Symmetry: D2
């Protein structure tokens, strides 16, 4: 009856997450001036370099140097001794207008409600009753361990901490009629960039006492729990200097930590016409509405689109046997209650608001104060 | 009892797939000279630009200009009229050595069998008895539609075709005791870059008669099947000019098309010490061995690692109720029969051989002549 | 009594000259919207790449992709078969604001007439009565040979010509009391990029009959004149693909072809507060005013500046013995008649007008319709 | 009888000079392994970025990251607080092979002595008896002021100094039968990058007492000498962050500070087949041999070449009336005594030795221990 499941998360200074945050800072900067900006901004990070590459058509006047450098400052990379500095890094820009062939097929001369999907693709939403926020415990804990590191770095409790971090949590679960019940934490991994001066034993002691014990309820930890803390032994070189970063290379950290499924599309740097984002957000909204509405305990929702077509091509519901209603019955409830055209999702979820930089670390789901996390009351 | 599932694939000239192929061309070039090369090569593509960024420590002498340009030539981008040309594009290189802090924690002064995982992470393998190659029909068909386009482009049957393409296939399935049985094709999408001179009606006629009807068995197509062929209406601008590409932004196309699960790690540009690749390949091998061995009809396998630790932290088996044996029983069979340390996987699957460029389009799984696709005979 | 002197020139598609033209296209684009734009734009060209690097503080909204690509189109690089294409090349931008430390020292809170020099430096102007335009015959002929090539390329007379070209002219002169008198052309070199299909003998025949004989008066050519036409034997690979280009690497071609002197400063990509440009233009104006005013036959003028100081630090006149007046007397005439503060030069020479792209090939001096080429009437 | 002349120099951390030093570090790195390396390496510097662009064909295996970063370390940019750091800056490489069309025209299948010039162009050498090193006093003093700043920076006397500096020296001269005699220093400018903490009055006091008075003989300074010390008032932002740098943008600082003449060609990043360097070095050698041989007091030498042709196209001697021999007589002495083919100059001046990084700051001429500064004994 029991099994293991593992999820990971990364910190705000992880090189891939730096790129996601920058891409969404750029998106927000455009939306502040032009709510209808078309944005597809990829970021690449390596030693001393932020490169912006992609397509933007917008009426906004954006200072890319300022936006990029302020985002990196916020993350905490402000000195060459940390391996990266917002004041002195290179910022290169290779941005062009959106292809007119895409524009004519997707949104030119179309009513906002009837805007075509900005691309083809598939997307999944997922929800589980195992936590109040309707997310897997494995990823919730992984995120919280990274957030605790940032907190202790920023308040001076552990001044040897740097911004680049990774965590991983293995939980032992019991099966419960298709739902899952967390029993204990089996293994925790933490790797975090650090200054030259602190030794390994001090780091491992702090990671156990001030990070893990501050985040994970004691009821989940026991004599058998395995700890891999600074398992490489040394992590002075970090950030983009240690490892190249790219936008959209943490798509499982951004979503459900391996639970449910993923259709492949990245979120960050994209406006609402890119269904990779808007439709994945709507699918989460559907999944969370089904669980918080008491129709099931655990659920996966698939949707798909074709470029230039407003309505989804397919919708599917998988409830793992956790509902008295059939999956067909749930599908019909979803069809009666949701309009999954991108031009309607934008209204329902306020997707022209410049709130995207907030989403780009610690996961897009199970977080405070987003429209896709507020359940819709269902009629049936 | 029936449901829809959708998967996509992309062609060799899709900008993300260009980057995956280049990253693996670079990997292969190093492995040809130095079997123990440590490679973490990211590629970025935009109008007129290939950028290499990442970390390589190798004894090989590699001409990056030649490797990159030959890969782009193979894909078919050989003239400015197509939007990209291997002869005249910019190739920029920002490659450094692997971090010594990583090297000391992972492989320096370690026995090959006892090499630590090159990073933390989670990985999944999947197999399904619905096709002989043990892959989902949705993605098999999607891949084959892109390969047919490349074939007809290269043999001059449809000389208006360009290298950038995307396909998407929705299949109606029936449930069968946890396994899945394909009934019909519900919807097909094809978008492909084209020359200025061909009209939309000629393209849509050719896409139906010479591509779809040449790939999809007639038994799956009927009067109700939906066709979205060149749904944007125009796709002259394409390749990196139309849309920026990055390595590792097609991870679901590379694997199972939404079926099973994904741990988040990209494959291309990485040597065998990066468990994102080696352990995902081994997990496929386990999944396919369980199905071809008659122990189940459909199966998902999770594994996870910590950086610097050779043995996996967790292993999990999910059989969807398609075995007479318990999941615990299958886990014990897997533990008795496989050694999932990266330093052993490398031997079993010949992962120092320069065969990776072959994997970087049309999916890494269900393909001819790879060691991870040859089942292991199981003792129990 | 006789001696040789040699000067060179390059065509509009020479890689260095591509960069000068782009830098001045960017300058003009800013000046069209903001006459007080502070611009220091460097351009770099290599295979498939235009990079903009430098400092701009301006109220203008400039589309750098459009400006760069239109400039390259004008030059004639419009197909991958020519080695470079404005439609498909990479354009990268690394532009920041002008340093506030420079701004505060040079122009903030200063009256326009009393603006400080934007940098330290030295500059020279030169004029010679040997041609009506008051320029050395060697460089006048070199420029005209490149312009003839562009003409015959653009009108289809020699359709095998490509935009990248270089010329060089050696003239035998006689001394005449410090002035110089051209006697004959001693040697001509022409190298020009060409298509694969034309042979060397056809090219050399055309270069003699349709280019040289169309430009150089027959009185200068004789049986002893030496011709080095396509002396490398093959020049198919050309433009940035053959040789990297940078802004400000043709400063002698831009000025006097080795005659007179040079202080080292580049012209292109710089607004009027950069005395490298404004003061060199004023010094030409002084030199040409002295010669056209009948005060001398040949003259060199030096000026110099310190950053943040409005008046020149030094002014010097060298007349080669070609005046009845002393050099001291000429210096006093120049001091009475010219105000060489950058904030006054800007008024006199209309240096906020967007006419700089015009200057960036075929030399900045001896050209039609520039204020620095119209003599000032001198009082003394 | 008296006149002013002004020359400038820049420090090792001036952004243009950073690029020259890097380009020559790369050249030296290749020559250490392959004496016949063909090198044309341009460097570009901006905030956080070193870009290498150009053409190299060589048997050497060069680590461009190491070479670039070590050069920047030597200069003194080792912390983000100084505006640039060798440890954390971006290094990008866009290097290709030399064009085969150039190679076939210049050196393939040719005897070393009969190698063609690597390009067309003109070059000048100059010498003056006004100093023992046969250089203009104006530029000698300007160089020495920058070297003094570097000395006091590096020994901790003035720890507020940073690596980016510029100087300028105006000397009052008397005419002496075509030669020039220095009388006094008229004006000195010094601008140097500095830390936030030092005030302007302390800087100006130190610049006068510890720099100027330590370099310039007191006999040249008097009550009328003008001092412009930190004339901008503030220079905290500096190096590539303050101003973009490029290779070959200090060609007058590299040579004669405005005296004599310049043909336009840059020196740094080029092997001996590029006559811009080898022939300019030989022309200096000729000029210095004429002066040290007692044939004249001041002399200018022009040479020119065509690509693919070994012998110069023209040679000219201008002695300013400082010889009893005619210029024709001096030309014939030069022709009898020198062989100015690049394949002979290489032997005479040891131009395959990796000593070029040494030349790339403080001028290429008048410096200790170079073959072009050792006079040839002349037969006539
Ligand atoms: C796995 C190291 S790196 C990925 C592999 C690397 N591209 C290579 O060249 O081998 C991925 C992430 O892991 C973290 N990291 C970096 N250095 C260390 C280190 N010395 N120890 C532990 N973790 C580290 C950072 O987040 C980094 O982005
Ligand atoms: C969805 C177009 S693009 C992704 C959106 C784009 N970044 C934007 O700026 O809007 C993704 C892929 O879709 C394909 N594509 C490109 N142009 C067209 C087009 N005009 N019609 C249909 N498909 C197209 C290519 O594979 C391309 O990489
Ligand atoms: C001297 C060739 S290149 C400068 C040298 C080059 N960097 C190298 O790597 O050897 C300078 C210029 O010369 C012209 N050029 C280019 N190819 C040829 C050629 N094959 N024959 C004659 N001239 C040529 C172009 O203007 C070019 O910018
Ligand atoms: C003239 C400043 S800059 C050239 C102009 C600049 N591109 C602009 O955007 O206005 C040239 C050189 O001058 C020195 N410099 C930089 N900042 C200052 C400053 N604040 N005061 C004095 N000199 C300075 C450095 O060597 C620099 O490369
Ligand atoms: K990476
Ligand atoms: K993209
Ligand atoms: K060059
Ligand atoms: K500059
Ligand atoms: Mg990554
Ligand atoms: Mg997608
Ligand atoms: Mg993509
Ligand atoms: Mg990973
Ligand atoms: Mg050049
Ligand atoms: Mg200057
Ligand atoms: Mg400069
Ligand atoms: Mg030259």
């Amino acid at each position: 009856g029991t099994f293991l499941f593992t999820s990971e998360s990364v910190g705000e200074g992880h090189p891939d997450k730096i790129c996601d945050q920058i891409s969404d800072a750029v998106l927000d900067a455009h939306l502040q001036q032009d709510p209808d900006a078309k944005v597809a901004c990829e970021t690449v990070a390596k030693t001393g370099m932020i490169l912006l590459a992609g397509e933007i058509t917008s009426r906004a006047a954006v200072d890319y140097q300022k936006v990029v450098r302020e985002a990196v400052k916020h993350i905490g990379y402000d000195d060459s001794s940390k391996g990266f500095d917002y004041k002195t890094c290179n910022v290169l820009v290779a941005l062009e207008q959106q292809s007119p062939d895409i524009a004519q097929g997707v949104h030119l001369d179309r009513n906002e409600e009837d805007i075509g999907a900005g691309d083809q693709g598939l997307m999944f939403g997922y929800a589980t009753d195992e936590t109040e926020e309707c997310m897997p415990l494995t990823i919730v804990l992984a995120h919280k361990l990274n957030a605790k590191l940032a907190e202790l770095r920023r308040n001076g409790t552990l001044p040897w901490l740097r911004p680049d971090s990774k965590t991983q949590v293995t939980v032992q679960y019991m099966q419960d009629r298709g739902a899952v019940l967390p029993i204990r934490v089996h293994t925790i991994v933490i790797s975090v960039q650090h200054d030259e001066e602190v030794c390994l034993d001090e780091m491992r002691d702090a990671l156990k006492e001030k990070v893990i014990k501050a985040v994970v309820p004691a009821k989940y930890l026991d004599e058998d729990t395995i700890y891999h803390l600074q398992p490489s032994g040394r992590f002075v070189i970090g950030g983009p200097q240690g490892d190249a970063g790219l936008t959209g290379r943490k798509i499982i950290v951004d979503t459900y930590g391996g639970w449910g499924a993923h259709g492949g599309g990245a979120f960050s740097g994209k406006d609402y016409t890119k269904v990779d984002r808007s439709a994945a957000y709507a699918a989460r909204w559907v999944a969370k509405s089904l669980v918080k509405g008491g129709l099931c305990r655990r659920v996966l929702v698939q949707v798909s689109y074709a470029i230039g077509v407003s309505h989804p091509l397919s919708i599917s519901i998988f409830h793992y046997g956790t509902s008295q209603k059939s999956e067909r019955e749930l599908l019909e409830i979803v069809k009666k209650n949701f309009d999954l055209r991108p031009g309607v999702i934008v209204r329902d979820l306020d997707l022209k608001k410049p709130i995207y930089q907030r989403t780009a670390a610690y996961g897009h789901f199970g977080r405070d104060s987003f429209p896709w996390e507020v359940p819709k009351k269902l009629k049936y």
